[PDB]
Curated annotation (Swiss-Prot), chain B:
Subcellular location: Virion
Processing and modification events after translation: Sumoylated with SUMO1 and SUMO2. Sumoylation of viral proteins seems to have a positive role on viral replication.
Domain remarks: The N-terminus binds RNA. It is necessary for encapsidation of VP1 and VP3. The N-termini of 10 VP2 molecules form a cylindrical hub underneath each 5-fold axis of the inner capsid.
Annotated site residue numbers, Interaction with the intermediate capsid protein VP6: M9, M11
Included stretch of the parent chain: 831 to 880 of 880
Sequence similarity: Belongs to the rotavirus VP2 family.
Organism lineage: Viruses, Riboviria, Orthornavirae, Duplornaviricota, Resentoviricetes
Role played: Inner capsid protein that self-assembles to form an icosahedral capsid with a T=2 symmetry, which consists of 120 copies of VP2, with channels at each of its five-fold vertices. This capsid constitutes the innermost concentric layer of the viral mature particle. It encapsidates the polymerase VP1, the capping enzyme VP3 and the genomic dsRNA, thereby defining the core.
Subunit-structure text: Homodecamer; each decamer is made up of two conformers of VP2, called VP2A and VP2B. Interacts with a VP1-VP3 complex. Interacts with the intermediate capsid protein VP6. Interacts with NSP5. Interacts (via N-terminus) with NSP2.
Protein name, per record: Inner capsid protein VP2
Residue intervals passing through the bilayer: none
Length: 50, 50
């Protein structure tokens, strides 16, 4: 979708939140990105993808 | 020195009507892309960790 502007610092945030326990604001941007770096290489799921 | 008209009468070569400008530059109209879109010699994109 070439969204060079929907800076992803976005998705990670929500993600973590949805599994309460983690104090989101109280966790840096770093780790977060690295988190994407790994997610990227992950296969979607037939449902989702389809 | 005695005074001899003839020899003291000279003609005058002068240009006509200028207009002198300083500062210069100013005449330059210039804007800027939005920061989120930079590039170096690279041309791929400076600052590119979305």
């Amino acid at each position: 979708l070439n969204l060079y502007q929907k800076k992803m610092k976005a998705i990670v945030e929500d993600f973590l939140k949805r599994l309460h326990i983690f104090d989101v604001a109280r966790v840096p941007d770093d780790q977060m990105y690295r988190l994407r770096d790994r997610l990227r290489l992950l296969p979607v799921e037939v449902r989702r993808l389809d | 020195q005695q005074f001899d008209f003839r020899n003291s009468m000279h003609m005058l070569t002068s240009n006509l009507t200028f207009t002198v400008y300083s500062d210069l530059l100013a005449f330059v109209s210039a804007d800027t892309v939005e920061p989120i879109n930079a590039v170096a010699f690279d041309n791929m994109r400076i600052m590119n960790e979305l």
